[PDB]
Amino acid sequence: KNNVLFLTTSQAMEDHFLEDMAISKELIIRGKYPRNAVYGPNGIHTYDINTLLPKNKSQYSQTILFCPTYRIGAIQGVLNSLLPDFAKLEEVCRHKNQLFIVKVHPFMKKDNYFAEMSEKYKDSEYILFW
Amino acid sequence: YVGASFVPYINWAIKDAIKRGYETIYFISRDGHFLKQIADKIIEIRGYNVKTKYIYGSRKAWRLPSFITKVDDETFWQFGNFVGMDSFEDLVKASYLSESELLSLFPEFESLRHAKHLRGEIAENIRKIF
Numbered sequence A: 001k002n003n004v005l006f007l008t009t010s011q012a013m014e015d016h017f018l019e020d021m022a023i024s025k026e027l028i029i030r031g032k033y034p035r036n037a038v039y040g041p042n043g044i045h046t047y048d049i050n051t052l053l054p055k056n057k058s059q060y061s062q063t064i065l066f067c068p069t070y071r072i073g074a075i076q077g078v079l080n081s082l083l084p085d086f087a088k089l090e091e092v093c094r095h096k097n098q099l100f101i102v103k104v105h106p107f108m109k110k111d112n113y114f115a116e117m118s119e120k121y122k123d124s125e126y127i128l129f130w
Numbered sequence B: 001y002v003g004a005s006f007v008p009y010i011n012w013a014i015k016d017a018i019k020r021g022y023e024t025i026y027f028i029s030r031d032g033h034f035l036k037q038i039a040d041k042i043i044e045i046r047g048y049n050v051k052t053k054y055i056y057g058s059r060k061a062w063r064l065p066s067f068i069t070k071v072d073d074e075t076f077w078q079f080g081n082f083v084g085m086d087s088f089e090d091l092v093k094a095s096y097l098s099e100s101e102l103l104s105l106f107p108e109f110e111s112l113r114h115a116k117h118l119r120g121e122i123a124e125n126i127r128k129i130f
């Protein structure tokens, strides 16, 4: 309540965070999220994207980023109910030259199914666990 | 040991049933096999005026038919149906559905074929799915 400068980004978000938090309105900072306006094309880049992809990005028609959230009260089996058949997903993405990037919420990395599929497709050409 | 565990209880229950006015006492399958023997001996010795009958049934044979107009929420919780299951075919038997019907409603469960521990969080997720 005395030392927290909270970063709001819009009037709606400012009102929301004022509702849900115990911050001081006179300590609010209005601006951009740095993580949304620093790593641009000509921005900062601490790593080359190509060292993480199975192939150069040019060899992919579309780069797809699957980024779900954690479901409250469940972890084991969520990913499986969202992506039950990774084999057919790989087939489809291959036939389409699509790179499917599994980037689940950190809390979800403990789903045994997640580890199973991450090991099963660690060297996959079209399914990449980030 | 078994007398001290059963006979005082059935003596109490018979006296209390008479005191409350019950005319017929039904002992239910399995548990009632020994209890009804005890109760009959007590009633004979004491000349108690009450009839005893034996009825066959179990949680299995009675819970499902009891779903008259709704499937109880208990069915999908910790003391419900999807409990203590230690294999995929155990899930099949707990679901009431045939294997093919189960996989046809919930294809994701195909990924649980070769698992051998369907307890814990996985059971809770399966309950939420059903």
Ligand SMILES: Nc1ccn([C@@H]2O[C@H](COP(=O)(O)O)[C@@H](O)[C@H]2O)c(=O)n1
Pocket (backbone or CB within 6 Å): A066, A067, A068, A069, A070, A103, A104, A105, A106
């Ligand atoms: N699949 C996901 C889900 C969340 N996140 C991170 O977590 C933050 C908060 O997301 P949640 O609202 O899902 O918790 C995101 O803004 C992002 O930084 C992620 O990096 N990958």
